[PDB]
Design an enzyme around this catalytic site. Structure first.
Site, PDB file in Angstrom:
ATOM      1  N   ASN A 117      -8.758   0.943   5.975  1.00 17.01           N
ATOM      2  CA  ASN A 117      -7.911   0.878   7.169  1.00 17.01           C
ATOM      3  C   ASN A 117      -8.253  -0.287   8.097  1.00 17.01           C
ATOM      4  OD1 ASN A 117      -6.434   3.090   6.323  1.00 17.01           O
ATOM      5  ND2 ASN A 117      -7.468   4.557   7.671  1.00 17.01           N
ATOM      6  N   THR A 132     -11.168  11.257   5.903  1.00 18.03           N
ATOM      7  CA  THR A 132     -11.529  10.890   4.534  1.00 18.03           C
ATOM      8  C   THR A 132     -12.908  11.487   4.243  1.00 18.03           C
ATOM      9  OG1 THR A 132     -10.258   8.839   4.796  1.00 18.03           O
ATOM     10  CG2 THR A 132     -11.732   8.958   2.893  1.00 18.03           C
ATOM     11  N   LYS A 136       5.999   0.142   7.558  1.00 10.00           N
ATOM     12  CA  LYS A 136       5.607   1.473   7.100  1.00 10.00           C
ATOM     13  C   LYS A 136       6.849   2.356   7.013  1.00 10.00           C
ATOM     14  CE  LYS A 136       2.080   5.078   7.871  1.00 10.00           C
ATOM     15  NZ  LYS A 136       0.741   5.352   8.479  1.00 10.00           N
ATOM     16  N   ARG A 164       4.980   4.603   2.247  1.00  6.89           N
ATOM     17  CA  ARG A 164       4.448   3.335   1.746  1.00  6.89           C
ATOM     18  C   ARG A 164       4.501   2.248   2.827  1.00  6.89           C
ATOM     19  NH1 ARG A 164       6.127   1.635  -3.100  1.00  6.89           N
ATOM     20  NH2 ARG A 164       6.880   3.666  -3.858  1.00  6.89           N
ATOM     21  N   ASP A 218      -9.809   8.245  11.360  1.00  4.75           N
ATOM     22  CA  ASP A 218      -9.638   7.729   9.996  1.00  4.75           C
ATOM     23  C   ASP A 218     -10.267   6.351   9.754  1.00  4.75           C
ATOM     24  OD1 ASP A 218      -8.939   8.363   7.397  1.00  4.75           O
ATOM     25  OD2 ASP A 218      -6.872   7.635   7.567  1.00  4.75           O
ATOM     26  N   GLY A 256       0.817  -1.214   0.000  1.00  7.74           N
ATOM     27  CA  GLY A 256       0.000   0.000   0.000  1.00  7.74           C
ATOM     28  C   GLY A 256       0.846   1.259   0.000  1.00  7.74           C
ATOM     29  N   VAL A 261      -0.723  -8.798   8.422  1.00  7.76           N
ATOM     30  CA  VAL A 261      -2.071  -9.356   8.331  1.00  7.76           C
ATOM     31  C   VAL A 261      -2.366  -9.660   6.858  1.00  7.76           C
ATOM     32  CG1 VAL A 261      -4.520  -9.031   8.893  1.00  7.76           C
ATOM     33  CG2 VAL A 261      -2.774  -8.053  10.391  1.00  7.76           C
ATOM     34  N   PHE A 302       3.187  10.577   1.683  1.00  8.24           N
ATOM     35  CA  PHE A 302       4.561  10.741   2.175  1.00  8.24           C
ATOM     36  C   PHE A 302       5.277   9.428   2.526  1.00  8.24           C
ATOM     37  CE2 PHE A 302       2.894  10.270   6.411  1.00  8.24           C
ATOM     38  CZ  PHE A 302       1.730  11.033   6.472  1.00  8.24           C
ATOM     39  N   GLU A 339       2.884  -6.074  12.624  1.00  6.59           N
ATOM     40  CA  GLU A 339       2.616  -7.480  12.342  1.00  6.59           C
ATOM     41  C   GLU A 339       1.892  -7.577  11.000  1.00  6.59           C
ATOM     42  OE1 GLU A 339      -0.008  -9.523  15.252  1.00  6.59           O
ATOM     43  OE2 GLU A 339      -1.250  -7.705  15.269  1.00  6.59           O
ATOM     44  N   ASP A 375      -3.289   2.053  10.386  1.00  5.97           N
ATOM     45  CA  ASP A 375      -3.137   3.479  10.046  1.00  5.97           C
ATOM     46  C   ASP A 375      -3.623   4.438  11.140  1.00  5.97           C
ATOM     47  OD1 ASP A 375      -2.647   5.936   8.789  1.00  5.97           O
ATOM     48  OD2 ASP A 375      -3.292   5.216   6.820  1.00  5.97           O
ATOM     49  N   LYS A 391     -12.378   3.667   8.012  1.00  2.84           N
ATOM     50  CA  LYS A 391     -12.812   3.337   6.648  1.00  2.84           C
ATOM     51  C   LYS A 391     -12.389   1.902   6.335  1.00  2.84           C
ATOM     52  CE  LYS A 391      -8.802   5.774   4.609  1.00  2.84           C
ATOM     53  NZ  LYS A 391      -8.421   6.917   3.724  1.00  2.84           N
ATOM     54  N   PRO A 392     -13.100   1.220   5.405  1.00  2.01           N
ATOM     55  CA  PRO A 392     -12.775  -0.173   5.059  1.00  2.01           C
ATOM     56  C   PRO A 392     -11.316  -0.369   4.630  1.00  2.01           C
ATOM     57  CG  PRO A 392     -14.847   0.472   4.055  1.00  2.01           C
ATOM     58  CD  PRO A 392     -14.238   1.721   4.612  1.00  2.01           C
TER      59      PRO A 392
END
Ligand code: MYR
Lengths: 20, 350
Positions: free
Chosen positions: B171, B201, B72, B56, B166, B50, B123, B54, B121, B184, B168-169
């Site tokens: 995250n 969002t 991250k 990845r 934040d 993902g 997932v 700023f 970890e 996130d 949302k599906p």
């Protein structure tokens, strides 16, 4: 339908987080 | 759990005690955060899972143990340029301090001349987003299962004076047991009063965020309303091609429900997607209990969910260790480390 309108919209992909 | 099932409300003192102990654990780590617990050469970089403005997230393999992790990577110069220093420091300080079954675990963190690193970890089940869009929509029992985990997670987070900001599906990751893990924490913040940052969002923003009002933890409960709607309908309650049009719809208050929504679902959603803060569920005198006691959640065993004893609606396909088949492909870029230290002062506490 609302569903069809959603699928035709530009926001069905991953939505970026926003801030200023 | 057994008591809660036997005598409703009898678990009250036990839940209170649990949260009190959880706060003690959190505050110790909050006050003295872990630092520099790994280094880059201890990992093999495999594939991007993902991307962001700023940074990845990469699948890595810990060389010595063989374990896979989601790393991250954040560019220090880009964080400074986008004015996100405090938010990034918030994210790391909170993540290393929290402990809950529905939150992705921070395993290691470190920094170098160029980047900040948070090793999470792995997932492998993929984002809820991917599954939701593909299937179209979840049934109400399916959505309820996920919603219940978010309710408990917010109960935990809000008790520590944390706002998530934040939901949302995208995250929400699905683990090997079919349970949610929240990821996130870029906008997460420890705040007792109100706060003012426009962040999140578009589809999930509460009206008081949009109207530059100053807000509190009630925005996470609004966001929950949006999530449950999106899961059960297959689309958000407020959508358009551009953000301005979305914001106009959110501030009107009007929500239309699909004909297949149950009466109980529509009622809960009317109470979560409530513009009036003195009326929004989760923000009243009884707090989270107004949500947990709602008719839509009558079949939900809250402690059993926490104990992960409930059968999940679906378990993702598992192909082996380090499989990325539940994740989309992304453009790979070489991770570059400068010979000069960038933004050292700004990120001292990381
Ligand atoms: C059965 O009723 C056991 C008695 C109560 C024990 C509850 C312990 C765990 C609480 C989980 C709730 C999570 C809230 C954030």
């Amino acid at each position: 339908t609302t569903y069809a309108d959603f699928i035709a919209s530009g926001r069905t992909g991953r939505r970026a987080s926003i801030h200023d | 759990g057994n008591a809660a099932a036997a005598c409703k409300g009898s678990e009250q003192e036990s839940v209170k005690e649990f949260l009190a102990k959880a706060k003690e654990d959190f505050l110790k780590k909050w006050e003295t955060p872990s630092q520099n617990t790994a280094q880059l050469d201890q990992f093999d970089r495999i594939k991007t899972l993902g991307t962001g403005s700023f940074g990845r997230v990469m699948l890595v393999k810990h060389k010595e143990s063989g374990n896979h992790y989601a790393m991250k990577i954040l560019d220090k110069q880009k964080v400074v340029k986008l004015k996100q220093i405090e938010h990034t420091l918030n994210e790391k300080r909170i993540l290393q301090a929290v402990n809950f079954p529905f939150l992705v675990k921070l395993e290691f963190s470190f920094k170098d001349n160029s980047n900040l690193y948070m090793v999470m970890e792995y997932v492998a089940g993929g984002e809820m987003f991917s599954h939701l869009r593909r299937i179209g929509r979840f049934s109400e029992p399916h959505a309820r299962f996920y919603a219940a985990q978010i309710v408990l997670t917010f109960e935990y987070l809000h008790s520590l004076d944390l706002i998530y900001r934040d939901l949302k599906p995208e995250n929400l990751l699905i683990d090997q047991q079919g349970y949610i893990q929240v990821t996130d924490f870029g906008f997460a913040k420890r705040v007792k009063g109100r706060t003012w940052t426009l962040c999140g969002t578009p589809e999930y923003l509460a009206p008081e965020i949009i109207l530059s009002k100053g807000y509190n933890k009630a925005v996470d409960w609004w966001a929950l309303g949006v999530l449950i709607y999106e899961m059960a309908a297959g689309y958000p309650p407020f959508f358009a091609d551009q953000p301005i049009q979305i914001y106009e719809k959110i501030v009107s208050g009007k929500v239309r429900f699909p004909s297949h929504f149950s009466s109980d679902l529509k009622d809960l959603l009317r109470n979560l997607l409530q513009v009036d803060l003195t009326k929004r569920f989760g923000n009243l005198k009884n707090g989270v209990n107004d949500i947990k006691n709602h008719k839509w959640f009558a079949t939900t065993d809250w402690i059993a969910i926490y104990q992960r004893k409930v059968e999940a609606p679906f378990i993702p396909k598992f192909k082996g260790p380090g499989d990325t088949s539940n994740f989309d492909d992304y453009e790979e870029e070489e991770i570059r480390v400068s010979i000069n230290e960038k933004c050292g002062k700004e990120f001292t506490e990381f």
